[PDB]
């Protein structure tokens, strides 16, 4: 995010970082359960990618987090790789996450809920702070 | 480098699809939701993360970072997957697995 600010660590406890095999960040995702993560379909997640939970900083020689293996990926069959429509994917953990003050789930809406134009919402991530 | 080692946040307003097409036109489909153009923007590496809004005192996932300004302009809206249009699929998948 460009023009955002640093979060209080632990304050967005559902936020996860997806890491490839080399081992570095290629997308974020969100915990909905101790067993599942929602992310975008275009991220191209595979079973060799790893989910990282409880993480604040990316340069620690070592920090206290949770690296979770992926058992199966559920891309939405409606996903259109040209149009980018129906951009969601579910990740089924092969080892439930261990909820705590820093790792927990976000709530999911209903299909009939209304989120009106004008609502002040919040987005988080580790993407670039400047193009 | 321009990547943050520390988790970043930002507040941004939701837009109507009506409004978002002013910018993106036809690229905007029913299963998409735009936010921003207010001086902040999701940018490379933010893909797949959440766009949450507070309902009944709890944060609810409304969007998933999907695409946006090829230059991450703060004047242009970010496009998110509309969770409301995809939730029946989530829940059903959850129900069977």
């Amino acid at each position: 995010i460009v023009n955002g600010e640093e979060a209080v660590p632990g304050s967005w406890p559902w936020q996860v970082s997806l890491q490839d095999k080399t081992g570095f960040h290629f997308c974020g995702g969100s915990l909905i359960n101790e067993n599942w993560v929602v992310t975008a379909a275009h991220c191209g997640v595979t079973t060799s990618d790893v989910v990282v939970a409880g993480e604040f900083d990316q340069g620690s020689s070592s920090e206290k987090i949770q690296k979770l293996k992926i058992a199966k990926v559920f891309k939405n069959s409606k996903y259109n790789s040209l149009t980018i429509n129906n951009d969601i994917t579910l990740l089924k953990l092969s080892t439930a996450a261990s909820f705590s003050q820093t790792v927990s789930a976000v709530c999911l809406p209903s299909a009939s809920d209304d989120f009106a134009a004008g609502t002040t919402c919040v987005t988080t991530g580790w993407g670039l702070t400047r193009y | 480098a321009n990547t943050p080692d520390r988790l970043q946040q930002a507040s941004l307003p939701l837009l109507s699809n009506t409004n978002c097409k002013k910018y993106w036109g036809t690229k905007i489909k029913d299963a998409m939701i735009c936010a921003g153009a207010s001086g902040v923007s999701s940018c490379m590496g933010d893909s797949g993360g959440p766009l949450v809004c507070k309902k009944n005192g709890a944060w609810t996932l409304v969007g998933i970072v999907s695409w946006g300004s090829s230059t991450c302009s703060t004047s242009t809206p970010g496009v998110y997957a509309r969770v409301t249009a995809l939730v029946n699929w989530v829940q059903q998948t959850l129900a069977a697995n």
């Binding site: 979060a7 209080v8 632990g10 304050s11 406890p13 927990s104 919040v122 | 949450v52 709890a58 944060w59």
Partner: peptide, 8 residues
């Protein structure tokens, strides 16, 4: 279900 223990 969506209430951080550490408030944002």
């Amino acid at each position: 279900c969506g209430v951080p223990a550490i408030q944002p």
